Design a binder for this molecule. Structure first.
Ligand SMILES: NCC[C@@H](Oc1ccc(C(F)(F)F)cc1)c1ccccc1
Ligand SMILES: NCC[C@H](Oc1ccc(C(F)(F)F)cc1)c1ccccc1
Ligand SMILES: [K+]
Ligand SMILES: [K+]
Ligand SMILES: [K+]
Lengths: 251, 248
């Protein structure tokens, strides 16, 4: 019904205004705090280094930003020695496109690289959908056999909560602990990464195996994408199950 | 069947190796070209400015990077205003997650986790709602074509293929070509960068290398284009999905 569609639209628009107000209340004080710090750090630098003009300072910052924007860290020569487009790293980038996560820490800079990325996404994202539906069909049988073992609506609510918590331990809690010890992040940053990854939001502020100073094994990046594949397939199979049940409720 | 699941897995793994090899062939020469430039720009700066040490240079670059990472441009003298924070909220819900703006505060990260968990399904309900209404529009249009070939007897699969190609092209003009032209004139991007942005936005990949508005009605109209754009193409995938389930 269109009456409920317009109703959900109001709930969503109110939700974004609510969200927007909460985010600005939490972030704007720190944003203003950082803005004051960078202005002071720059001014104090020019005060200590008289041989540098404010104009040639700007040019150097721009050169450093353009380098980082390209994907090359302007910090040291040793950090530059590693590549972001190696056979392994470019395989994970491909996966980052296909899963619609799109971190953005690495992005195509080449005009041709952008053209191929457009075509790669258009044909590649449905190809992943087919794989995720495939694992989603097998997991649906696993879920179906587990509910058949156990009011049908109460059983189904108890079942779904258990499956959600099952995935929350196996694909959310356990891998977050691994990232806390491997990537050296805080308890929050680790959970935050896992959540932002599996929701396919992928901000890119936290990316697994991204620190130049980290001596990460060769099996790390493929196992991370494997965790993404099993983690996304699992919670997709759960949403498919809730969707199919809601369609039965409507009819 | 599990035989076809393992088959799709091989196709996908081969696709990522293929993709990975193509991306490195296209990007690694420019990546090495940039790496050489930054090393030279820094070294040439230190030779011109002798009063600056190589270490207190790194410290300044780090301060500039930490500022940009926080969302404050270290070039010249807000990203969390009522309007901008509304669009950020909309970026989370649509799963686009550009990343040009991201929660820095420990509490801001906590709220972002909870906001996504409850907010993304809420969008799914809205997108399904528009997807249901558009499905009736598509369904009534295919039922019109099938009424013509009732006595002419033309395979239902052929009718369904020509119709879907038309709906895909309809969305490609209205929500892909036309808005890309607007971004080319407004944001001042190149013809490629404009199409690339629209594609990376509507696929919800959202790299964040290109973000719209980075007038007051611009940011909400951009999210409105995103809402109708995602909903239209989600209605088309829903239609192809429902038909494939009937085929199985
Ligand atoms: N959640 C909707 C996903 C859907 O979105 C589109 C559809 C079409 C396009 C276009 F035309 F290429 F620009 C981009 C994104 C989609 C993404 C990748 C491949 C096919 C369809
Ligand atoms: N495959 C994308 C769907 C997405 O999947 C999840 C599910 C759960 C989680 C998490 F919160 F971390 F447990 C993160 C992502 C989802 C988000 C909100 C509700 C249900 C599912
Ligand atoms: K993203
Ligand atoms: K996404
Ligand atoms: K994304």
């Amino acid at each position: 019904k269109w009456k409920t569609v317009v109703a959900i639209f109001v709930v969503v628009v109110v939700y974004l205004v609510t969200g927007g107000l909460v985010f600005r209340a939490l972030e704007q004080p720190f944003e203003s705090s950082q803005k004051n710090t960078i202005a002071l750090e720059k001014a104090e630098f020019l005060r200590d280094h008289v041989c540098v003009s404010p104009q040639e300072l700007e040019t150097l910052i721009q050169h450093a930003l353009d380098a980082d924007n390209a994907g090359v860290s302007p910090i040291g020569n040793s950090s530059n020695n590693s590549s972001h487009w190696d056979l392994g790293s470019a395989f994970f980038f491909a996966g980052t496109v296909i899963t619609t996560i799109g971190y953005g820490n690495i992005a195509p800079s080449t005009e041709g690289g952008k053209i191929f990325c457009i075509l790669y996404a258009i044909f590649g994202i449905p190809l992943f959908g087919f794989l995720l539906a495939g694992i989603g069909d097998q997991l649906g049988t696993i879920f179906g056999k587990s509910i058949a073992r156990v009011s049908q609506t109460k059983i189904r609510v108890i079942s779904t909560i258990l499956f959600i918590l099952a995935g929350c331990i196996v694909f959310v809690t356990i891998p977050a602990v691994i990232f806390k010890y491997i990537e050296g992040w805080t308890a929050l940053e680790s959970i935050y990464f896992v959540v932002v990854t599996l929701t396919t939001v992928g901000f890119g502020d936290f990316v697994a195996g991204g620190n130049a100073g980290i001596n990460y094994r060769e099996w790390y990046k493929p196992l991370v994408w494997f965790w993404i594949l099993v983690g996304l397939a699992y919670f997709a199979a759960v949403l498919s199950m809730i969707g199919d049940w809601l369609r039965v409720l409507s009819k």
